[PDB]
Amino acid sequence: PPTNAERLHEFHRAIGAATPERPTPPPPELLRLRQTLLDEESAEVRAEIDHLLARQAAGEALSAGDLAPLAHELADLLYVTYGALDQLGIDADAVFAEVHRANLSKASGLKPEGWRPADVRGVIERLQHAP
Amino acid sequence: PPTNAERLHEFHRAIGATPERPTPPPPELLRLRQTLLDEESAEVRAEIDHLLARQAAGEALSAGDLAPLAHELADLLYVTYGALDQLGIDADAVFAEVHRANLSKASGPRRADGKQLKPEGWRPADVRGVIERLQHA
Ligand SMILES: O=c1ccn([C@H]2C[C@H](O)[C@@H](COP(=O)(O)O)O2)c(=O)[nH]1
Ligand SMILES: [Mn+2]
Numbered sequence: 001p002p003t004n005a006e007r008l009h010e011f012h013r014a015i016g017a018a019t020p021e022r023p024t025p026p027p028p029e030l031l032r033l034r035q036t037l038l039d040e041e042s043a044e045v046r047a048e049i050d051h052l053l054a055r056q057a058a059g060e061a062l063s064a065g066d067l068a069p070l071a072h073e074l075a076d077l078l079y080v081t082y083g084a085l086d087q088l089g090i091d092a093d094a095v096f097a098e099v100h101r102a103n104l105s106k107a108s109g110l111k112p113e114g115w116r117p118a119d120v121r122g123v124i125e126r127l128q129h130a131p
Numbered sequence: 132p133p134t135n136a137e138r139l140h141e142f143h144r145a146i147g148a149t150p151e152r153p154t155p156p157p158p159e160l161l162r163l164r165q166t167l168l169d170e171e172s173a174e175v176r177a178e179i180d181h182l183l184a185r186q187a188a189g190e191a192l193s194a195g196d197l198a199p200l201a202h203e204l205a206d207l208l209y210v211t212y213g214a215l216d217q218l219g220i221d222a223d224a225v226f227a228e229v230h231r232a233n234l235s236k237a238s239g240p241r242r243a244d245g246k247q248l249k250p251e252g253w254r255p256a257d258v259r260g261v262i263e264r265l266q267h268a
């Protein structure tokens with residue numbers, strides 16, 4: 001039952017990294033690190049996608065196992081993306097749920113009538129009052 | 132209660148788009164998933180740059196100022212989970228394995244920018260093992 005977002009909180013406590021309980025404006029140093037890790041892991045995803053495409057172009061029959069490096073790098077990207085939300089003190093699950101509500105709603109239409117976009121600002125205000 | 136990976140599965144069913152087990156995709160699908168990751172990563176990147184520029188100007192950010200960044204981060208999760216789901220790969224099973232090998236880094240040194248590094252004798256996640264597990268069962 002632990003969510004992936006909750007696992008990030010467990011990771012940051014284990015390594016002594018900042019992990020605020022509620023949304024908290026960050027020092028510039030934190031934003032710069034989050035940017036660096038996002039650039040790093042997304043570049044790794046791109047490299048693995050490129051290798052698969054090149055193998056395919058040459059006629060290689062890919063197996064399920066061939067996807068492991070890509071899957072690993074996609075999970076690393078999830079990890080640093082959740083990681084940014086966690087260091088900001090923002091419950092990733094709450095924000096994700098609102099983005100999903102909006103996307104899932106839109107799919108019942110294009111827009112259904114009475115549709116409302118993701119209101120992440122509202123989610124962040126409500127998270128400031130948690131407890 | 133549904134996980135974020137399962138929400139992606141639900142979204143894909145809703146739009147009529149995905150395999151139950153790990154499945155090698157056609158090249159077009161790979162190129163499409165790359166495009167969506169690139170689009171959302173660029174929006175995250177631009178927003179972080181934006182915040183950094185405001186702080187450099189002496190502005191003290193409020194929690195409320197973080198809403199657009201939080202939104203873009205969640206969009207990025209959406210398309211990243213989306214990629215895994217279209218590959219037929221259970222995101223949570225892979226994430227759990229990656230998480231376990233991340234916890235084991237705790238004793239390692241830290242880089243100057245704050246990145247946690249790997250201690251001596253560390254061993255990586257076995258994601259190949261996870262894929263094999265999902266593949267058969
Ligand atoms: O400060 C850190 C260092 C590493 N990781 C995570 C994200 C990935 O899952 C992985 C990247 O580790 P490297 O292989 O790049 O060292 O560990 C973090 O979340 N924060
Ligand atoms: Mn890396």
Ligand SMILES: [Mn+2]
Nearest residue numbers: 041044073076
């Ligand atoms: Mn990686």
Ligand SMILES: [Mn+2]
Nearest residue numbers: 171174203206
């Ligand atoms: Mn976006």
